[PDB]
Design a protein around this ligand. Structure first.
Ligand SMILES: [Cl-]
Ligand SMILES: [Cl-]
Lengths: 224, 218
């Protein structure tokens, strides 16, 4: 749908009607759940914009441990780093649900800027937003304890994916227990320990691949 | 000014930018002075201005449960701070406070927009710069996650040495004009953790304190 796409960084509230003959300049791509869109260290000159579904963005250490940098969703762009800075992928992108996306290569993207510097503005916004988040995560890593980081990641997930459910916030993250801990960037044992405490205190309820946050207030205080 | 121009042109935002174009922007920026101990901006305040330091040092902090501030990093000559605000304006997510007298230049988003309006080729180069930087800082984040707790603080202190140190016999010499109370004020809420990492470095032969200058292995 073009409604999702017009919320995408690149073309975000620009053309009233002729936003369309450019979306058609991209053929769509459907991926099953658990599909490796691209792997660490592969060449690439393709960026993707998600129409629906989620994609986890990951790094793997020498000894097989995994970290998740971010979870991408509808309207989010990924694989953009090798577009602007040619070279191999430094991250893996893996589908966590069935995903509909749309795809574009560097030369095509370069073509859609030579008319339109406002698009470049929007892409620089996205990169700077991501730079800020990584810097905010770096600060959390050194100076916030694991439960505070669990609390922060749950609230960050809620900011992107949450929906109100009465006096509570439903956050359908589509992540496994292990993937939540990889996203936090801390041990499964200590992340599960924090989640249990927060559930016991009645701040959250863990339900499949969704969490219900009943007390965003006390959760936020803990993330401080 | 000769030497000033050189310092400015080393800023990260100018990487791969044609030198006359760098000069066309900087000639437009008003150099300013800050005294030591001056909060250039606080966490939370409206953000739309990038600074490039010509001389002096600026600490970057974030408020801790203490009411004191944790030390996130230190910026020096040729470094930027507040730079992300001109690409993605909004509240500051950290504070910037001078640790010495400082001379800097700044630019707001309007100055950026004007610079690029005439120079469409700079947008593509800026996209490369921000992307290369994001790859690097994500690489750093992941490395640090994969490191143990005390190893994280040591790596960060070593990154500061690399940025502020002069190469001297395979080691890094960092000189400062900071009192004992000014060092404690600098580290802020991070004092205990920084002190443990220094004590470890000292015990292990990594650091030689030569008064107001330190030699550190790299
Ligand atoms: Cl990429
Ligand atoms: Cl900022």
């Amino acid at each position: 749908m073009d409604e999702i796409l017009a919320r995408a960084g690149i073309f975000q509230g620009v053309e009233p009607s002729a936003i369309a003959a450019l979306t058609k300049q991209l053929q769509p791509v459907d991926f099953p759940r658990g599909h490796t869109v691209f792997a660490e260290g592969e060449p690439g000159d393709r960026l993707y914009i998600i129409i629906s579904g989620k994609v986890k963005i990951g790094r793997r250490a020498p000894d097989g441990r995994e970290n998740l940098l971010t979870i991408m969703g509808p309207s989010d762009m990924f694989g953009e780093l090798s577009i602007f800075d040619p070279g191999p992928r430094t991250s893996s992108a893996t589908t966590i649900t069935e995903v509909r996306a749309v795809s574009m290569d560097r030369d095509a993207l370069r073509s859609w800027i030579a008319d339109r510097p406002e698009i470049s503005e929007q892409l620089l916004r996205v990169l700077a937003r991501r730079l800020r988040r990584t810097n905010n995560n770096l600060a959390d890593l050194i100076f916030t304890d694991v439960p505070g980081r669990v609390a922060k990641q749950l609230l960050q997930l809620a900011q992107r994916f949450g929906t109100q459910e009465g006096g509570a916030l439903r956050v359908t993250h589509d992540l496994t227990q292990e993937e939540i801990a990889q996203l936090v960037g801390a041990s499964r044992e200590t992340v599960n320990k924090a989640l249990a405490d927060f559930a016991h205190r009645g701040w959250i309820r863990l339900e499949g691949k969704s969490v219900l946050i009943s007390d965003s207030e006390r959760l936020a205080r803990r993330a401080r």
